[PDB]
Every structure is written in structure tokens, then in C-alpha cells.
Amino acid sequence: GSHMMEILRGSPALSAFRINKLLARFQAANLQVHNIYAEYVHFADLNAPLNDSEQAQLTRLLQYGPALSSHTPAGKLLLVTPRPGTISPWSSKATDIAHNCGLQQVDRLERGVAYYIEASTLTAEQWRQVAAELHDRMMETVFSSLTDAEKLFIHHQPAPVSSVDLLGEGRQALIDANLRLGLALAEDEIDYLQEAFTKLGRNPNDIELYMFAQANSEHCRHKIFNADWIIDGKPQPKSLFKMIKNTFETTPDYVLSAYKDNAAVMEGSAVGRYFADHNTGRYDFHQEPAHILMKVETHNHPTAISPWPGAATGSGGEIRDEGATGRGAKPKAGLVGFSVSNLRIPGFEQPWEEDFGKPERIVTALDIMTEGPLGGAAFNNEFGRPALTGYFRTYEEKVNSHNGEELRGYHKPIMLAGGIGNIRADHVQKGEIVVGAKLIVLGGPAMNIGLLDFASVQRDNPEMERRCQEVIDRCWQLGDANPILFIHDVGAGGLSNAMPELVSDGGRGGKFELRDILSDEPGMSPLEIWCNESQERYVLAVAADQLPLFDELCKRERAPYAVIGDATEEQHLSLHDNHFDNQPIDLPLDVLLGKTPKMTRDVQTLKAKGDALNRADITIADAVKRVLHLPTVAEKTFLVTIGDRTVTGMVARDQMVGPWQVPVADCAVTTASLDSYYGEAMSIGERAPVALLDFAASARLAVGEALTNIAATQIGDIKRIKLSANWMAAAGHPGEDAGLYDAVKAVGEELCPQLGLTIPVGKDSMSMKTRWQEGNEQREMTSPLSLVISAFARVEDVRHTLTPQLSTEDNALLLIDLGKGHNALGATALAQVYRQLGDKPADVRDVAQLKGFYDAMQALVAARKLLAWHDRSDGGLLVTLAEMAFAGHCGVQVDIAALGDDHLAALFNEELGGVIQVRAEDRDAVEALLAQYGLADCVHYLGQALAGDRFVITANDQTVFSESRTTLRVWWAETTWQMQRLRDNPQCADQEHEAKANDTDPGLNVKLSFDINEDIAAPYIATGARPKVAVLREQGVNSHVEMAAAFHRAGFDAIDVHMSDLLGGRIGLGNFHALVACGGFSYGDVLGAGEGWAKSILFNHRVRDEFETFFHRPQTLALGVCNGCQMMSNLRELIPGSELWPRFVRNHSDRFEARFSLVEVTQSPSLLLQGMVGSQMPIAVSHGEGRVEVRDDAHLAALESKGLVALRYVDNFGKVTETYPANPNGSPNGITAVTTENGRVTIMMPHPERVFRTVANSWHPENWGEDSPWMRIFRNARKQLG
């Protein structure tokens, strides 16, 4: 009706490398395309007119991104847009910016990509193939006109509820609905529904059946995990779930919550929890217990269909699980896992890989590993949690396993996302839901999502979830006045699961109004509103008298919320519809949550034969090369540098280790607070291919490896370590059900209670198989049983963590071989890379000795007797030693004669254990310590790390294997090289790869022009006079807490200043002498990073004036970091002395870069870098749009001549660099900070505030104390103010 759509043209959309890729793709499909050009195009659906000033504002909002060369359009237009009926996340954010800039006339903004294709005459046939290359069929459509985008904004009238005519047709009505709605109901569930509605005397509504079906799936009831079993004809006494709970019955130690919430909780440490007070707005430390929550989800089916959103919402859903623990809690750090079939990277096929086909309807393993990590990282980056540990396994082979010869793999992948958080002691327990409590949906509007498998295409808006987390944080930060009585995440089933679960958990019923739920799709039916799986939502209960407070909190964060119902004493569920004046749902809860009896699974053991490894084509040298090329083993950088590892300022140990930043850390460690050396650790263990031979061994190894990956961290009591067990299986596949029972028993009833390990959380995914028609033949690809164990623990001292970085001081390398010389080769990387399974796999060989291992390591860690540790896992001792030599950038000389005559088995078995490095003078003491724990016969002196490039393995006087360590390290890098090369700018991928081949690279290294231990602010702090700093944040910012903390340590009173506070008058910048614009992803970077934030200031004349006035005062200081640097660069019209500043645009890599980068401080006016000029030291970088862009060389030369460049990326050799990733973003002349003429304003891309604490620097010199060099910036600001 009365809307009108405006078209606004945008910038050129693809860089020269992406255009070439497209042209090459067209060439290789024999489509004669001579040229292709693309522009972004924007569509504004308007509800009232724009005046000229508004219109110019909207046009300006929509000019963003890198200044790529524009061209006059020519050839055939193909416009790609989101498909009609969908709203992109880009839309949600861009429209929020328009609204925050005072353009309420904009109902919605949407974007497309206009492609202009010049081709020979192409059949309509071939035009469709061109169009297919240019869009994602699961999310987008192609139009032939710009005006066709009107279809994206059509207003549809609400669809009414539909009843299913049980009373008029009998059981057939329920049968028909089952089919037509895809309810997947069993016979006995159809019976139950028939009887329930017969008793009620009325026809069920569609919404009620849908809801019921969502509540009664195998999964939502966990029928398998609660089933009775009979195994080989004997009834078993416990369900799988009871056997897991056995670990809690045996070891309840330190557990605060298990099996009754959205996450498990264990005891943490008493530390200073740092946040801004509700009454003052000032950041302060609050000394109190910070207890530790933990959870791990999977998202396997959606990732097979659309991997980017599948992975993104796997992380997003898990983050809501965390925030909705107890009465509200705070995510801290994440972990990520993938298992896929063989990559078969074009031009880099490996000799074990065979193409077995796949279903047409799923994506490939390569597409999952291309798009899926980017999705997981998009959510973690934009929400703001660091991703600090993970796994990635490839497996796809035709093997003689439990059910004979068949294809085993991961066409349906594992996509795993988990994390830890912190929680207050008084919020661990869910509160009572008082009768009459208000029932609220916190979060995003509902769309028709989760209802070609379009129903499995998810959608992520992380910035929305950050806004909600800020509200959750405000609530828990009120302590006793936290108004959240009860909270739950919204996930599977949408509100139709979440609301009834919330009321039911509190022993209440609810009454709801459909029309009070926020919706962005007015066409939706009641079923679609109630049951859709739209993201970034939470449900909670609050007392009516707390609404004004909750409203204030949400409005300050710009977090949408709706009060949608009231908790009732009666245990009934009612949903009313004010629009249709009727009652879509009217049910007793016991009807809905009544569910018929348990399952019995009556099953049989199948055990694989086992075939000795045929070693005809195997040599040691060839094996080394192959194994280094297995993705499971190979360097993981493509999965690591795409995800932030520094947000919060609490990351102590990330994946990257040492001066050469080699991703081999065995576990993650965070600090518990910004004022403590207590912390938390996370590790993973998994060994699925072993399950093709021995189900229970595979489970024991997952537990064992979690422990060996965590063991060189200072924990103490093994009972401190708590596990998530995520069970992936093809239930019903022959042999798999008995295997599953045996595996759960092996860990739940046996190994975990014996070791003293609790499993207080877990999940299950029980249809891990794919079937399709290939020739005329039915084909199937079935996963091994795949247990993933994640281990979580309180850490006693983060400073004492060891890594695989070898020292070349005089040393001894000692193998701890928990295999006890079994040296198994079955189901190893070695076997896999020669297309075999082998005979007998590794296993836990001696439970006492595994515990003894852990205890001995804990003793050695606490006594500081270890130089390094690296455990043995995929690729064996060979890979353990190789990875240590890579991390230490050195050689090894080791002898293996004591490990058996079979050198292949000694080097490549994947038995538990690993290598410790000790000082030579400590070898005897360490061996005696290990002997005290019962390990003497498992312990073997191997030799030593030596300076240089030789990787040497001997056995008596024979050389078993010898090769350049650089050669091995480059082979090991080739997979990440190839993935980066196909996914990112290939020039950057090549530069990064090639740098690894230069052994003379000295690694990160420091030069200091000042005393980093000299607190120049101390005389000021000692007065007790603390100037304020405005810690400025906009919606989506994430790095404000640690920014506050850095200024706090330098003597400031850090004030939380939201952009909403400046709009509402609750703060005025006239009361401040210092302001800092913080990092993150304001508005998700939509409309260009920092742009929405800056233009919200520029387009509100009052706030614009406020900023201009602050910056023109003679003594004020300002700092902009990351998103803040971008924001300040985007309103330089307000900042004196800033006329030569550049813009900050998409990195040359075309990828987010989370790096620990070397920079030098350069001479400039900057008052914040006084005393530091000439210093060189690393700094945290975490950005996608950090590349300095200038208008032309005139501009660059002027900026440089003016002397305003304050930081530059250098290589490890100390030279100013544009080579990647030493310069991570492509900025000319390495530029990454600039200042104004007077030196009072400085802006920079890297994050000094994330690394002001030495313990939070991924690598640093051993002689540093608590302060890193970057503390000096904050101290300089304090001293300058005087």
C-alpha cells in the first residue's frame, strides 16, 4: 500500500581478485563471459517522505566501503538479493542505524548486488548457469530489474489459525496433518493426541499440534538417552543418562549445578569482578566468587544445508545457553569443533581421498570448512567472546568396520560450539516464579525461520545478542536487586518450547497474548509466530513492580523486549489473539508435556574384524609427508586467525604459541578477572575413527586426551576438572547402538569415576548418517560413533602454563608413553593416509597410571620443573616432536631404540602421553618424580632440542628419519595455505605461507625505549585525585570493560558512557577531560565499520555539538581504539588538526585478522605515546576493516610529511612492512595509528587495552613483570592531565 521504495546506488562490490576468480570460474564451465562488474545497490522502503536534508543524510549513510574503481554499467544486469519473505541481518542493522540517525520514515533498508555481465550470445540455459554462480540458492534470488526488489517489501495480512478436524473426520485428520505439517509423530503419539482432544471435546489447532510435535521429538524428550536397553539378550540396569549421572554421584566435588539448567556450574575463585555500578555509572572491582559455567552444543544438520548460518547460530545458541544460566550470567570464552569428509581441495588432492559422491541437497566438506568457520567466527567476533581452543577432523573412507565394508565419514558434519562463562554465587539457582510474574521475550523480532531444505537455513544477528547480553549483565550486576527471577534461552521450538518450559520449570502455567510478541513478518500465522526458530531471543520472568527498571535497562542498551504474558497458579497454557479475537492455544500443561512411555532398545554387539596394516607402500619418510598433509594433523591457522583471541583482556593462553605464533597450544587459559592470576582452562579430546574398531576405546581416549591436553596447566586436584560429553552417532545403524551403550558405560560407570572426573553436562545428536542415490544404487555415508569431550577447570596460576615451545638451553626430552609399548596403529592418522583402518587401536592402558600422569604433571607444573609440554594425539610422537620443533623454531636429536624394533609403530601410534622438556640439570629429579607415581617403565629419555634446522630420529647407530625442520613445518602448513588461498586474497595466503620457509625469521622480538616497570602515574594516583574518563560505547561495542580497567590502573575513574546516555542528557562531555571510544562491532559494522556510530553523532545536532566542543577544548585528550578509531576517523570534521587523516576499510586479505602483530612507535605529536618512540613490541589486532586508505598519493605524502603517523607494523626483522600478515591489513607504510597536529587525539587499530597485562600477551619476554609496555599509554594520559 502506502509505502514507497527508493533505490540508492552504492559502491563497487568486488575487488580485482574476486572478479578474476569469477571470470576463471566461468571459463572452467565454458561460459564465455568477457567481463563482470558489480555494485552494491540499496533499497529503502519508506513510510513518509524525506526532506532534502534527510535525503542527503540517507544517501551519505549509504556510501561506504573501500573506494574501489567505479565503472559505468554495461551488459546484462543480474541483481542478487535475499529471497522474498526473508530479511537479511544487514537489513536489521542498517535500518537500526537509519532510525538512530533520526530517519524514522525508513521502514526498512535492504541491500543487493547488481552484477553487469558482458558475454558472447549465451543461451537462456547458459544465462541460468551464470546466475547460479552469482548467488546462494538457499538464501538469495536473482532478478532482472532493480525495481523487482519491491517484492522484498510486500505487506501481507496475518494468516489465521487453522483447526484440524478430528471431530469431523476421525483419526485421518491427525494423519493428514502429520504429513502436511511434517510433524513426524509416531503412532502412539497420534493415539495420545486423538485421546487428548477427544477428551477436550474440540478440534486441535495446527499450532497446538506443531507445538506438541516440537516438544515430543526423540531429541527434545531425549528418548535414546532415557531408554531401557537389552544388549545381546540381557536387560541392562541403567539408561545412558543414568550412567552419565553416575559420574556426579561418585564425584559431586566442586559442582554447583548439573543437569538442571542450560549449562553446568562449578566453583571458581574469589576475584575482582569489574563492571559499572548502576547508581554511579563508574567501573569498579567487586571482590567476590566468580564461579564457572560451561556448555557445549552441536548444530550438525543445519550446517550440512547452509554452513555459515549453521555454524553462526550453533555458537549463538550456545552463548544464549550461557547467559540464561541461573538468574543471568556472562559468557567469557568459546571453543569450536568441526568434523567433515575429505576436503579434495582442487589441485591439492591427497592420495587417500576418493570421490564417493554426495547428496545434491547438502554442501561439500570443503564448502563446510570454507563457510562454516567464518560463520562461527562471525558470531564469536561480533558478539565478542574469544575462541581459544577447538578441533578439526577430516574422515571419509571405505572401511571394514563393525557392519562390514562400507563408507564411513561426515557428509552430515559435526559442528560444535561451546564455552565458559562466569556467574555470581547467588544467581546459580533459578528463582521462584511468583504468581502474576510478567513473562518477557528479550531480543529480536520473529520471522518465519526454521519452519531444497529452506527450513534448515538459519540466520544470525550477533549484534542483537550482544545488546541482550548487556541487559543480562545489567541485571546480574544489580546483585540482590537483579530483577530476573528466571531466564531461559530460546532455541529449538522457539517460543513454543521456551515459554512452556519456563512456566513448567517454575511450577506455573501461563497466559500469553500473541499480538504482544515482536514480529517483523505481519503475514505470519499463529503457528509461525509461536513456533519459528528466529534467533537472538531469551524468555524471562520478572515481578510486575520491576518492569520500570527492566524497561530503563533495555532502553539504555537498545535491546528490544516485549512483555507477552503472565505466570498463573493454574498449570494451564493459554495463547490469545487480539487480532482475530480468538484463542489459538488453550491446553492443560500436563496434556502438552504428558508423553507416553520410555523406549526399549533391544540390540546386538557387532565387532569389527580388524586387518593388520598392509605396509607395502609405506616408508617412514613417505608417512611423515602424508601425515603432515592430513587436515586433522596439519596447521590450523585458517580456523584460528579468523576468530578474535583477545576480547575481554582475560586471555592468557591462546592457540598461537611463542615468537613464531605457531598454533599448537594444547589448551586455552583465561584469567578469572583483570586483577588475578587465578583463571579457567578449556581442552578437548576426541578420537572418533577409533570407534570403527573399538567403541569403548574411542571413548576412553576422548577422555584421556582431554586430560593430556590440559595437563600442563596449574590446576591441582584432578576433581577440579569437569567434562562435557557430546555424543554423535547414527543410532540404528548396525552395531552403533550397542557401541554407544558400551562407550557411555566405559566412561560413565568406569573410567570417569575411577579418575574422579564428573560429566555434569552434555548433549546428543543421534542421526549421523546421510543416504542418497548415486548411480542407480543407494549410497550411504555413516559416521563412526563420535564422542567429543570438552574439559573445563579452575586454574590456580595462569602464569605457570607450559606450551610446546622448546627451549634450546641445555635440556632433556622425555617421552611419557602411556601406551606401555603397545604401540597400536589401528585407526591412526598413519592408517588413514594409506586408506586403511588396521587392526587394534590405542586405548587407556592403565587407569592408575593415567591418574599418576596427571598428578605428576601437576607436581612438575607447580614446582616449575618443565620447560615445555606437548601431548601425543593425531600423528603420534612424530607429530608431537615436529610441532614442538616448529613452536621452538629449533631442531631435535632423538633416539627411539628403546621404544621397540618397529620404528613405524613407535613413531606413529596415537597412544596417550607426550613429551616433556626439562632442564638437563633436572633430568634425574624429574625421572625420580615420575617413578614415584608409578611411571618408570613408561618414561624414556629421547634426547634434546638443539639450535638449528635439523629434525633427526636415530635408533642405535641407524638414522631412522632426518629432514629439515623448515621443510616439515612448510609441509604441515600446506593445508592452511590452500584453504586461505581459496578463501581469502591469494596474494596474502601466499605471503604468509612463504614467510614460514625463511628459517632466519627471528620471531616476535622487543626493543624498549623506556622502563616498562616505571609507574609514571604513581605520584598522581597517590594523591587520590582521579580524573574521569568517558568510556564511550555504542550498541554492539564489546571491548569497554578492559578499556575501563586499563585507564583505572593508570588512576582514572572510568565512567560508562553509552551513546544513549548522551542522547538522554544523563551525561555531558563538558564534565570530562578525557574520552575513549572503545572497540567492537557497533551495528555489526553495517554501513562500514564505525560509520553508524559516527553518523548518529553527526546527524544529531545537539550531540554533534557536544563532541565538537569537547575536541576543541584546549586541554582535553581523546583516544580511539579499533571501532573507536574507525568512528573517530568518520567524524573528523569535528576534530581539530585531523584534516589529513585516512579512512579505515576492508583488509587487503578480505578476512578478519586476529593477530599478535609487531609494531614500532614512531615519532609524532601524540601525547599518549610520549617516552615510547622507537619501541618495538607486539600488540593485539582484531579487525576486518583496519586498512588505511588514502584518497591518493598526495594525501599519503601529506599525512606522512605532517608527521602524524604514530604506529607502524614492522616485520620480525624490524622493517616497516606491507607484507602479510606481519602487516595484517595492507595499510600503506605500515600505518596503524595517527594523531592530530596538537597530539591531543590519537586513534589506532590495535588494542593496547587488551594487552596492558603481561599475562595477557600471547608471547612476551620472560623478564617482564605485571605491566606490559602498553600500560604506558594510559599512564601518559594520567600524567598529561596532571
Ligand SMILES: Nc1ncnc2c1ncn2[C@@H]1O[C@H](COP(=O)(O)OP(=O)(O)O)[C@@H](O)[C@H]1O
Ligand atoms: N575448529 C577450530 N577452531 C579453532 N581452533 C582450533 C580448531 N581446531 C583446532 N584448533 C586449534 O589448533 C591447535 C591445533 O589443533 P589440534 O592439532 O587439533 O590439537 P591437539 O592435537 O592438541 O588436540 C590447537 O590450539 C587447537 O585448539
Ligand SMILES: [Cl-]
Ligand atoms: Cl538429518
Ligand SMILES: [Cl-]
Ligand atoms: Cl621466547
Ligand SMILES: [Mg+2]
Ligand atoms: Mg594435533
Ligand SMILES: [Mg+2]
Ligand atoms: Mg594436544
Ligand SMILES: [Mg+2]
Ligand atoms: Mg585433539
